[PDB]
Write a protein that binds this ligand. Structure first.
Ligand SMILES: *[C@@H]1O[C@H](CO)[C@@H](O)[C@H](O)[C@H]1NC(C)=O
Ligand SMILES: *[C@@H]1O[C@H](CO)[C@@H](O)[C@H](O)[C@H]1NC(C)=O
Lengths: 49, 98
């Protein structure tokens, strides 16, 4: 859904259409997200500081 | 002949609490419409006609109900068309006597 905002999400209504179904049937209790970082010429290139 | 190499492939089939993801080639009889026939589209054994509807179903939906909470609209998978379910006919025999 396109929007032009940073924070304090709008009060508009937008239903979520489903996506591909996964018939797995396993055990689950925890999760984590993944992020991407950039290594330009400003940074030395080491993932320390 | 007994010393020639042979390639052996072994197939194993197991059942778990996970639902069926592999199925053998499913048969599919020809679709007849506008007639009082019986169908089983994986969730109900309904008997009735299959008319051509004018309402589109979203591309994830296989079933369909109404105000009175009755399954009267089911999507055919192979042709992805929307067909309504209607009871054939029922009633009584009334007579007039002079
Ligand atoms: C899923 O987890 C529950 C509890 O964590 C366990 O009882 C159950 O056996 C698990 N299912 C499978 C298929 O291992
Ligand atoms: C159903 O599968 C057949 C091949 O088995 C294909 O020709 C047909 O287009 C399919 N119908 C769909 C995906 O609606």
């Amino acid at each position: 859904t396109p929007i032009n905002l940073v924070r304090d999400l709008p009060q508009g209504f937008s239903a979520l259409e489903p996506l591909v179904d996964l018939p797995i049937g396993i055990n689950i209790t925890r999760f984590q997200t993944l992020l991407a970082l950039h290594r330009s010429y400003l940074t030395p290139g080491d993932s320390s500081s | 002949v007994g010393y020639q190499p042979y390639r052996v492939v072994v197939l194993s089939f197991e059942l778990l609490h996970a639902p069926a993801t592999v199925c053998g080639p499913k048969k599919s009889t020809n679709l007849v419409k506008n007639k009082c026939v019986n169908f089983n589209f994986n969730g109900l054994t309904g008997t009735g006609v299959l008319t051509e509807s004018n309402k589109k179903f979203l591309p994830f939906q296989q079933f369909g109900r109404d105000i009175a909470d009755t399954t009267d609209a089911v999507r055919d998978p192979q042709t992805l068309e929307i067909l309504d379910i209607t009871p054939c006919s029922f009633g009584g025999v009334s007579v007039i006597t002079p």
